């Protein structure tokens, strides 16, 4: 049911309705002679909606916000950027002259900024230590710490137990270790053992790219992680 990376044409979006006022969005982009794809997510805030991450470049992210229109009908209100990789910022452009309010960390604003990628225009506070939490709008976010890269941030959508763990959390059919040149290696165990902590109640688990789980998908990133680390 849930679309797959072979059944997404690159500049295409799809969504998928995980709960009453809860979708991911999925994308595909060619990258160094493959083709990856891509999540996000959409939340319902009352007759508006927040957009958590980007679709990876303008056009996709243009796709996106017309299959919102066409698929949902509401708008675009706001949105978050869960760390400065192109495939969570590339876009933002699009969203900002779309009349979104777009938001990242402190940390991700600065690691954009020094990467060359979009920079979201409003920063969030309250974030900067690991295991800090604020509340936005019908989301948490969450930063547990350094791990795909240090500034990830995880969202959890209390309504429907609904965790997005962005590219910190692996699909289970991903079993090595992806893109770790921005990664904490050390640090991502204890990071993934906060986001446990802090979510034990989850119920479906979406990673930053490929299939949904529930939090199997934690312990699965670990033992891949750690196996990495012991090449
Ligand atoms: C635009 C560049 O973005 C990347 O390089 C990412 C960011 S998470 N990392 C890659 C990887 O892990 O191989 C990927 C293809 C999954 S997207
Ligand atoms: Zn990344
Ligand atoms: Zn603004
Ligand atoms: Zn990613």
């Known amino acids: 049911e849930y679309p ?7 500049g295409e979006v799809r969504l998928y309705q ?12 060619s990258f160094d002679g493959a083709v990856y794809p891509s999540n996000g997510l959409i939340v319902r805030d009352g007759d508006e909606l927040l957009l958590i991450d980007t679709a990876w470049g ?3 992210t243009a796709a996106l916000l017309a299959e919102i229109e066409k698929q949902i009908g ?4 706001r949105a978050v950027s869960t760390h400065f990789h192109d495939d969570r910022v590339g ?11 777009t938001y990242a960390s402190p940390s991700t604003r600065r690691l954009a900024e020094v990467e060359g990628n979009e920079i979201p ?3 969030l506070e309250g974030l900067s230590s690991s295991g800090d939490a604020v509340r936005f709008g019908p989301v948490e976010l969450f930063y547990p710490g350094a791990a795909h ?9 209390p309504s429907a137990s609904v965790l997005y763990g962005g590219c910190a959390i692996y699909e289970l059919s991903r079993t090595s270790a992806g893109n770790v040149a921005d990664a904490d290696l050390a640090e991502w165990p204890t990071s993934i053992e906060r986001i446990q902590q802090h979510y034990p109640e989850a119920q479906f688990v979406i990673p930053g790219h490929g299939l949904p789980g529930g939090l199997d998908l934690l312990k699965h990133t670990t033992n891949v992680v750690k196996a990495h680390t012991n090449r």
């Open 91 to 101: 876009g933002v452009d699009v969203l900002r002259a779309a009349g979104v309010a």
């Open 74 to 77: 509401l708008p675009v209100t």
């Open 18 to 29: 995980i709960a009453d006022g809860v979708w991911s969005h999925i994308a595909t982009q």
């Open 149 to 157: 890269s240090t500034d990830n941030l995880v969202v959890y959508v």
């Open 121 to 123: 225009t409003h920063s």
């Open 58 to 60: 303008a056009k996709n």
């Open 4 to 10: 797959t990376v072979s059944e997404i044409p690159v």
